[PDB]
Design a binder for this molecule. Structure first.
Ligand SMILES: [Mg+2]
Length: 539
DNA sequence: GACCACGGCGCC
DNA sequence: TGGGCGCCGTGGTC
């Protein structure tokens, strides 16, 4: 490991240290590069950043993000993490990827660059004759790492003053519920403490314990348990309400405003690219993929997300991408005609299980077909089906068998995936992204059947992901050539920011690029809204 | 202060 | 016996 003075040969492997994991908040403590068997250690890291053509190494996207806040372009290129992730998506961290493919992840820039070259070598050849996963790395993941670096650096604009006024409203509503419940308890206790609540609910008050917690076996105070004791006591509704408010206060309203960045006046997530078993992205520090939208107070928080002045937000949402993906994968003639005909899946699905004349008089069957249609994706069981309808474990089974008479190639796809899973030891997406699921042949049924749900969701969830990522790759350069921005992805939706004048012209472009990303035996449909805020934009 | 397991819950 | 995530407070350890 011979030490050459800094200016490194072109195309070298970078190795960097940050004071903290978040590139947008980090100081560049150290910089290195490696090519052949030579270590080029930068004396002045931020200065040294100017000399690179592209970032190439573990966490390439991170360095490209920090470079971007500093004004420097610098895209990300090869990343052994991206390759390892495609071999086996349980490869999430460089600690692990190193300590599996022949290195040690250290807290030193040069050894991080020495690790990069070494890890990349040992992995790119480990991808010999994986045409499919090489296509995924070239035409999806490497390019996307750039797109994500641009998104992460842009950030999304937030109305702080608005959030701070909320905090004061919600604070006060919390205070009333708090003092209600205590009066009902006949004493005050910490309502954030589920231990203390447990005692209050089940010992002190006389209430029935419905279920128990997994690891420790305490009486559960979850929503599903409290929603089931709604009738039994007026303290329960209050507790439910107090959880709603404190969850949203503690998770979103209170902390988000403090994470505005001095240089931008914007919020910056991290989009982790090698963090999940299916090939979805996750979002982090903070997570903007779980900003609320169901509840009223929830919907008020979402208004806080706004466009720069003079711009608008464009929100684009795929419409049942996962069902459509299933239809494509299963090849169920019946099911794909429901999307080709431009019909309302759950309407038609109800009108096929029961087989009601045409489409007529189905208010409680709409719920019934909707529920099954996502419950085939997660492996929803009869009991669970029986619990969500008010109907018993018996009629619910027949719903399941009926649905498979409606859709016989779904079942055959299901079973085929399971068997090839056991055979090859993994399952895979339409683009050949794989997830190894070795418990498919476990001797304990609970764990086997748990494995099976994991196993047959992955091809659909990962294909929806694959489809979204490829769209992001395709769409982005069209947005840049239009001075539009790409702000967030939320699994099957995209939030873009565009200038008021061109906003409709961006919407149209974005929508069409997404409906046409990779055409299937069904069509992809996309809803689009425009607005000053995320809520308004009509997600 | 930094971190941990847990139960809980927001989103797709 | 519902897939995939990340973050909250509590209660507790160094
Ligand atoms: Mg949506």
């Amino acid at each position: 490991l011979e030490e050459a003075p800094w200016p490194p040969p072109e195309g070298a492997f970078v190795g960097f240290v940050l004071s903290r994991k978040e590139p947008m908040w980090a100081d560049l403590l150290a910089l290195a590069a490696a090519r052949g068997g030579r270590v080029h250690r930068a004396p002045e890291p931020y200065k040294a950043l100017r000399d690179l053509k592209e970032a190439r190494g573990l966490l390439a996207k991170d360095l490209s993000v920090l470079a971007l806040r500093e004004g420097l372009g610098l895209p990300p290129g090869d990343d052994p993490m991206l390759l390892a992730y495609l071999l086996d998506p349980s490869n999430t961290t460089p600690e692990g990827v190193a300590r599996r493919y022949g290195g040690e992840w250290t807290e030193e820039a040069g050894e991080r660059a020495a690790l990069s070259e070494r890890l990349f070598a040992n992995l790119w050849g480990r991808l010999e004759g994986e045409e499919r996963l090489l296509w995924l790395y070239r035409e999806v993941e490497r390019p996307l790492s750039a797109v994500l670096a641009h998104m992460e650096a842009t950030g999304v604009r937030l109305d702080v003053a608005y959030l701070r006024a909320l905090s004061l409203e919600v604070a006060e509503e919390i205070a009333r519920l708090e003092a209600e419940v205590f009066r009902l308890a006949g004493h005050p206790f910490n309502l954030n403490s589920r231990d203390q609540l447990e005692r209050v609910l089940f010992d002190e008050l006389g209430l029935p314990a419905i279920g128990k917690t997994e690891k420790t076996g305490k009486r559960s105070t979850s929503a599903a348990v409290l929603e089931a004791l709604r009738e039994a006591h007026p303290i329960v509704e209050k507790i439910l309400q107090y959880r709603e408010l404190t969850k949203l206060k503690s998770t979103y309203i209170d902390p988000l405003p403090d994470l505005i960045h001095p240089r931008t006046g914007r919020l910056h997530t991290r989009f982790n690219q090698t963090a999940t078993a299916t090939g979805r992205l996750s979002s982090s520090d903070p997570n903007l993929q779980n900003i609320p939208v169901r509840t009223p107070l929830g919907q008020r928080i979402r208004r806080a997300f706004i466009a720069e002045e003079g711009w608008l937000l464009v929100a684009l949402d795929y419409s049942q991408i996962e069902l459509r993906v299933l239809a494509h994968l299963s090849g169920d003639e019946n099911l794909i005609r429901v999307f080709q005909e431009g019909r309302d899946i759950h309407t038609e699905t109800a009108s096929w299980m029961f087989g009601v004349p045409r489409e007529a008089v189905d208010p409680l069957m709409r719920r019934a077909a909707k529920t099954i249609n996502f419950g085939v994706l997660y492996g929803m069981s009869a009991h669970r089906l029986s619990q969500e309808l008010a109907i018993p474990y018996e009629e619910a089974q027949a719903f399941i068998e009926r649905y498979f008479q409606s859709f016989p190639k779904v079942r055959a796809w299901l079973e085929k995936t399971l068997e090839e899973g056991r055979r090859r030891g993994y399952v895979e997406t339409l683009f050949g992204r794989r997830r190894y699921v070795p418990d498919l042949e476990a001797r304990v049924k609970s764990v086997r059947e748990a494995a099976e749900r994991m196993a047959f969701n992955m091809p659909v969830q990962g294909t929806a992901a694959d489809l979204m990522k490829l769209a992001m790759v395709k769409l982005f350069p069209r947005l840049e050539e239009m001075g539009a921005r790409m702000l967030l992805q939320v699994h099957d939706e995209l939030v873009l920011e565009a200038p008021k004048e061109r906003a409709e012209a961006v919407a149209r472009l974005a929508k069409e690029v997404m409906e046409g990303v990779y055409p299937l035996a069904v069509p992809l449909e996309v809803e689009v809204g425009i607005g000053e805020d995320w809520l308004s934009a009509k997600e």
